[model samples]
Target: KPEVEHTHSEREKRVSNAVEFLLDSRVRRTPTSSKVHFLKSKGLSAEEICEAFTKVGQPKTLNEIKRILS
Candidate 1:
């Protein structure tokens, strides 16, 4: 594949940063079943996790990005 050197808009950059954060993140030491579990410790869910990931994968929208921290 050829390397694309296109620059992203602010929204795109934000979403990219978020996905990077998730991929490198870890659950609590107590042990969790899924990404939703880890996030739920702070109050979230698996469906929510999937929805958020899907949103980021689809478009660079702030509404979707904001929910990542929710």
Candidate 2:
């Protein structure tokens, strides 16, 4: 039999792993496309998006990658 690293089932573990990888990747290398993708999905601006991280109750979304680099 195979060992399960996570307490969650296979399906749930995959979902959790994907989300974890995505977040870690973002902290290291936030892509510009991801920022536009979030805006298109949520109708938010770059500066407003930053504010959300501090003010919002929950994690709003990814930030503007170019803004951080420039």
Candidate 3:
């Protein structure tokens, strides 16, 4: 359980860093299409995508977002 918690924490950090990088570099303008496209182009994993979605309140990809949302 502790290990699982730690892994989750680390994953969030990675996702947050990726999100921050995208935002800070002007890669993402409004947490929408541009941001999602950039993350996909950069090869971010599913978990990272989900994390970004949670923060931004929407997702760009269909399949992955469906799984994460419902």
Q: Relative to the true structure, how large is the alpha-carbon lDDT of every model?
A: 0.42, 0.43, 0.59
The ten-residue window of minimal lDDT in model 2 covers 51-60
Q: What TM-score fits each model?
A: 0.31, 0.27, 0.44
Collision pairs in model 3: none
Give the runs in model 2 whose Cα sits over 4 Å from its true position.
1-36, 56-65, 68-70
Write the residue-wise lDDT of candidate 1 on 1-70 in tens digits: 5657634353454444434434554522222234334443443333444444565353324454345445
| lDDT at position 35, candidate 3 | 58
Query: Model 2: C-alpha RMSD to truth?
Result: 12.1
Best-fitting candidate, scored by lDDT: 3
* Residue range with the least summed lDDT across 10 consecutive positions in model 1: 27-36
Candidate order (lDDT): 3, 2, 1
> Which residue pairs come into collision in candidate 1?
40-43
In candidate 3 the C-alpha lDDT for residue 37 amounts to: 58
lDDT of 3 by residue, 1-70 (tens): 4453446666667677666765564554554555555565565666686667666555446566444434
